[PDB]
Symmetry: D3
Subunit: 315 residues, 6 copies
């Protein structure tokens, strides 16, 4: 079964939890252990009900309160947990795009791994938060082959109900072959077109047909025929169709690798997947990497930052 | 029974009414007695149907036609009567905030005396008429304890289905006591939090428990522990819980007291409550004040302004 | 039966059609015969499915690809066929109003010949496309009696469910008579008022009553009492009530008259009536004018423009 | 000499005056006598320097502080006195137009009595404050002959350097005569045209030429040929050309007449002419009305409101 | 000498002219002969003074009055002549871009034949009229090589003070040769780079160096190496450097060729060059075409449209 | 002397540098060594000249070209170097406030260390880039004492021309003493008010008077009477007045401390002070820290990022 690590607190009362957070912040200092405990043990919908009771009881929004009480990564991870899911991704896209430079990788994690219905919700929430239109913003901040793949992803046009038909999986696998390996350059239109429109079941069957004609896997073929941003965008889709839990277990491992941490990725994957398949992502992490995801966080992170994260994650 | 003073015209024809109003304004002069009569004897829903036939028969809006034929308080009262009810309060709020100064008292009349579903409607009609967000605009034009009470009010978060439970009514009455009378200062958070979230039946029970532990009523305690705008904000909620008809009979009485009139209060309350509980507000007014509301208006107001008001109100 | 000239392609595949249009523009040149054929033999809803698949396969919009491959009227007509129908009218309006001058005649064709629900959709699509409000925009770009008829039109307030009542048809016929013929001036309010509010069935009955009291038809009386823009605005309503097909067969004939063509009218009527009643407009054209519609276009137009138009029209 | 009643404080220090206001609001209560004293004995440019130092010393704007400490008419007058002069009128216009109704009379006081240069500054300050265009807003909120008079005033196109030429003063006086008195109706275009473009010296000479061809004055001729808003509009210009001080002495007298006060007018004229010609408006008031301006305000107004107003006006 | 065909009316009075136009439109009908006369015999700056007096005398804008009195091409030409010159061109770009399709040719006439300082003004007038940014809009409505040449044009970065240096003219001519003729493809960056940055004196020198190394002129080389929009974009710059008057005499000739007229071009070139170099364009027309520009218009055009146009042009 | 580490390239040609950057990116790969070289050895105004020529030569902006060729921290440091100086800071503010959380420290680095003139430019560049108002944005994203210190900073109201007057330096040092050390609480208004308004020379004199009355330095008293955000806000002003170069040397040292780097601080301070006083900040770094700033970067950083940063810094 695919499930996340956060489950709704049983015998929840938003009034009482709003009043416990007010008490945790009252006076000088803050009781972070209380804040961490409430946020990390209520589901996102319960956190949204705590938030309406806090503003009705107190006249101030819980968000504004935390930004004055908290700092740095604990503030960011806490604040992430109160964002309605769709909005959080909508906001993470914004951050990737409108800074100095681009988090190319944040855009791939969010647009390339998504269903049609999720793309339609991330597009809506961005419009609502930012008044601008995301495809118009993606087209302003990206160019070339990469831009084109993210414009495809924003349409929500995959033929998700297309059935596995092996004669066609074979026609497409051959088509991709001629585009890549079968010629000197690469016709990128054919990579983008097939990986953007075919259902995920039908894409699986293509990948298998491709290994019977070629002596490289489709991953190897993209890895050789493509460079940079579009190479990582197209491999994200291949990894999503083959095994989504491994894609994120990978992206998480890389956040924690070497010196320091890429907390931005860490907060983003842990928080977004927490109520969808963070349980599965954890078993795939362990199997691929030796250590547990818990152990990994426990070593790379510190303070309350580390605690909040380790209570979302669980052992 | 709680009822207003304006009941829908039986055998109403908006085409014929639209035609009458054009005839009452044609030429030099205006036939005010005819405008007064159609506007005051039609319910607001009928006046909205008159409004659509006027613009489709004559290609100009009835409002624009009135602003030319009328002046001063008769124009203001006549135009008040044509506004959709939600829009009229959203518009009164705009006028209280975005002038020279603040009509602190219009903002309390509209936000502190409302149910969750009416707050939600006044908020939406505002965003529609003004493109801005009311909670954002109240936060720009107010400060401190009063701003927080109006931010609580705009959430629509009262637990209106909360049942009378005496043990709790008793625990909150005790908590309000310590926050006020039982200490030198005043913890205002406690006052704001209890009056803003409990249901009105549970609040009634609290006020009763408070008098058994204090020798003062909750109104006296507020009157003493608080000043200015928040003192008035908080007593509007207590007065709405105990007797809403008396709150408004009071506010009307003060509009008409002394020299001149506060027509802005007078038009706003008469017109908003005309199809809700103006009958009951009229009986409480006489009971509290000696004179009838009819008689009060007849003395303080003049011309056609006086007649339009006296026809909405009735004897 | 009333029916247009374009019927949905049976065994339609949007993925394959998108692919064929990419193949038709690939390289230097364009294969216009291929574009003409896909556009002219798919219904507008099928063209919208081809659009979503083109953008998901290729990551560029079919519109942007045609603007670069095509030019002049073939670009205009091809692009007109791809617009969602409501949008295409909201766009036409924009073009009439906001240039050097006014295409007075576009505004009448679109606003004066429409049902309540169609007026409400054109109004919506305009607000969506252009963020401004259409009635605010028609009031900025028109004045006087004309402005007033087009504001009436924009209210969607015709009493479409008004039943044929001869006694009343007779009272209004007589009212229009006094306003016009029965007096030196013209009371325009009465011509506007009756033509804007009465159902089309009840209007038919009035035109009949009018010929029994007058020796002139309502057309001749409008033709004489009125000038210019409003004279053409009021005759568009009468012609729509008596015979809509003839209104357009007329408009079309005039587009193709003399030296050159008014392609802007030609593309607009052909394309908006193609799936509603272009077949009926074509019979009425022949009947009124001797030659066929097909024959007329075939003579006044050229290139691929002419072929596209001839395929949408049929023989 | 023409001069106002408010002169710059000699040995002014904005830092000290900012600190004195902070001390007058500190704590419970407010020391209104101290706020009245600084605001009323500092010229408007000194008040703006007090405003910058308050916000740099305490990090809150002075305005926000006074809205919390003050109420009603004292809040409104104290806040009027802190507005930059051009912004105060741009705001007074906004208030006259976008409420329930129109203060027809505020609009004429501001737009009909002004020079080209002032109109151009009220226009600019409005667009700044409100992002909208004043002419576009006057055209939305007014109709007909009055709207045209107000659009004329907003152009800033009076030929102010036009010299007195009696042959033409005579030609125009005659033209005005034929437009009005010399015919049954009124050609308003001629009244509008000559009163809006000719210089004020040349206009004076015209009024004189008129009385030699008519037995009525131009005032009487306007008074009879015109009604309502445009009659008051055109009389404002005539009284501004003949005697501007008397125009305001009149409007002030009427603000204070009868029961109550029209404080809105009262604050508006006293505060806007305080540094221009409130000295002269005061002599003309006494001379026309018997009592002093000071004496009038002292009877019609109360509290601290009356004190502020009595310090701006002087004896 | 380079000069236009409209010269400022000597003994011009804007008040008297504004009055003459009101008289021309008063009543039923319009006196087009009078409007044609004032418009065509006043310079553009005088027309802007007539425009302010008309609005200050009558309270309505001249433009709005002409849209109600006029129709079709006379309305368009008479309104073109009242537009401030910069605005006219910003408005023409808007009309080329934001309709159904693109007038690719309007964009090249305006952007590819301009100085740095004129581009800078057309950019400014667009942002002013439209609130949007012209480069942003040109990037939305165009793609590819063409887009890139128009984004170059909009920078205003031509090195206008660069001096004729034959060694470099020779070096660039050589560079263009290799880009084009000297290879199978075309490196377009090299054509775009040299024709967009070098001064017009230097460019002339290059064209001359080019003919000594090639056997084709740079025109023939562009004509062969390029296609469509970019081919005409690049040839507009070469024809502006060699002879601007011939570029427009050609554009004008094609507006009038065949059946009908392209009035849109005809009004646009005649009105924009009328005070710059229409007299030169007229001598080049005759020289190149046989007939006079006057005689051409006289045959292709009609009504008052034809007259207005023949007055602007002269014999 | 106070000077930065980047000096204008002598014999600079923007056309040739723009061509060099095109060649460095052409094809697959990028020649980062060339890009680093031009960006790091041209002053910012020279970089703006390169930018205009790149877009006029190639029709695409240099920023868009780098985002596609670069990645990570080299992208951000390269793009940082191309921003107009005022825009860069206005962009840094935006990134500090509008993400998940607040970079409290970037806001103090920027707003608390600036002159009046600099604050006024950051305010303008923000409004321009972001259409919003910075003060309004700081007031949205910050609360309490901190917000008030940053609102004071945004006023540009420091009396920079205030002269050192020992009697007053002593009066204020004693006021700060009673506000802090001389009482249990802290009156923060007094710390805010003296630090925000007095000139930097007068402030130095105050700090000296304070140590004669107290036994602790003003830094120790702030360190003890204050907490968090406002403690760091007030200490940045005290460090700015005493020694600006040490404030930054301190901030840089902390960016590079421990595991990882805070690149965002590193790029921000290196880039902003490069042409102002990076030479002095480097001497103060060595003196305070043992190692050179060069040596520090060279250890904490890698790749091309490290090279770019080491070339802007110098040895
Ligand atoms: Ca705390
Ligand atoms: Ca914080
Ligand atoms: Ca290959
Ligand atoms: Ca690590
Ligand atoms: Ca009337
Ligand atoms: Ca009115
Ligand atoms: Ca107490
Ligand atoms: Ca009274
Ligand atoms: Ca092609
Ligand atoms: Ca095209
Ligand atoms: Ca008649
Ligand atoms: Ca024809
Ligand atoms: Ca106080
Ligand atoms: Ca107040
Ligand atoms: Ca008369
Ligand atoms: Ca009075
Ligand atoms: Ca006319
Ligand atoms: Ca027209
Ligand atoms: Ca070639
Ligand atoms: Ca022709
Ligand atoms: Ca490259
Ligand atoms: Ca990148
Ligand atoms: Ca202390
Ligand atoms: Ca480090």
């Amino acid at each position: 079964v695919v499930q996340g690590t956060v489950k709704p607190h049983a015998s929840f009362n938003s009034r009482e939890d709003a009043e416990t957070l007010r008490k945790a912040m009252k006076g000088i200092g803050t009781d972070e252990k209380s804040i961490t405990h409430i946020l990390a043990t209520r589901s996102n919908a319960q956190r949204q009900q705590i938030k309406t009771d806090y503003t009705t009881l107190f006249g101030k929004h819980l968000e504004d309160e935390l930004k004055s009480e908290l700092s740095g990564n604990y503030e960011a991870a806490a604040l992430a947990l109160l964002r309605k899911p769709d909005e959080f991704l909508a906001e993470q896209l914004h951050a990737a795009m409108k800074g100095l430079g681009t988090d190319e990788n944040a855009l791939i994690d969010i647009l390339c791994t998504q269903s049609n219905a999720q793309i339609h919700a991330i597009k809506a929430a961005f419009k609502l938060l930012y008044k601008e239109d995301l495809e118009k913003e993606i087209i302003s901040e990206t160019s070339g082959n990469f831009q084109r793949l993210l414009v495809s992803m924003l349409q929500g046009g995959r033929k998700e109900d297309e059935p596995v038909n092996a004669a066609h999986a074979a026609e497409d696998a051959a088509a991709i072959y001629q585009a890549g390996e079968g010629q000197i350059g690469t016709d990128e239109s054919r990579f983008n077109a097939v990986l953007a429109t075919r259902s995920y079941p039908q894409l699986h069957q293509i990948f298998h047909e491709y290994s019977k004609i070629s002596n490289k896997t489709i991953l190897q073929a993209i890895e050789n025929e493509f460079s940079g941003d579009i190479k990582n965008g197209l491999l994200a889709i291949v990894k999503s169709v083959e095994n989504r839990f491994a894609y994120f277990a990978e992206r998480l491992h890389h956040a924690m690798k070497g010196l320091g941490t890429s907390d931005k990725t860490l907060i983003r994957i842990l928080v977004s997947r927490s109520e969808i398949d963070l349980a599965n992502i954890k078993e795939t992490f362990q199997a691929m990497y030796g250590k547990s995801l818990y152990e990994f966080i426990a070593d790379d992170c510190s303070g309350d930052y580390k605690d909040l994260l380790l209570q979302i994650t669980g052992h």
